[PDB]
Design a protein around this ligand. Structure first.
Ligand code: NA
Length: 97
């Protein structure tokens, strides 16, 4: 039940709610924010020219094997990612790897 506070399944796929920190040593999940209901994601890219957004999407597209788009928070640390055409059960399985 750990990652479930950060995700919900709509007709389109899964909205994965994250909070990023850019300029990290490695793009990876580092935790969960229990109050905000978001996965803490470090992103190994600078927050300029959209590069942290691009790296974030790339990481999750690779993890889930599905298209990932930003649906809210393009210019925020708090970003909502639509994982297209996937189920919550799939997403949880992959986040728990
Ligand atoms: Na960015």
């Amino acid at each position: 039940l750990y990652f479930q506070g950060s995700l919900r399944e709509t007709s389109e796929g899964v909205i994965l709610s994250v909070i990023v920190a850019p300029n990290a040593r490695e793009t990876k999940i580092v935790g969960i924010d229990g109050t905000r209901g978001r996965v803490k994601v470090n992103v190994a890219a600078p927050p300029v020219k959209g590069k942290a957004n691009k790296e974030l999407m790339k990481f999750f597209k690779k993890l889930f094997g599905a298209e990932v788009v930003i649906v809210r928070g393009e210019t925020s640390r708090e970003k909502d990612l639509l994982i297209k055409g996937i189920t919550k059960k799939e997403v949880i399985e992959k986040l728990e790897l």
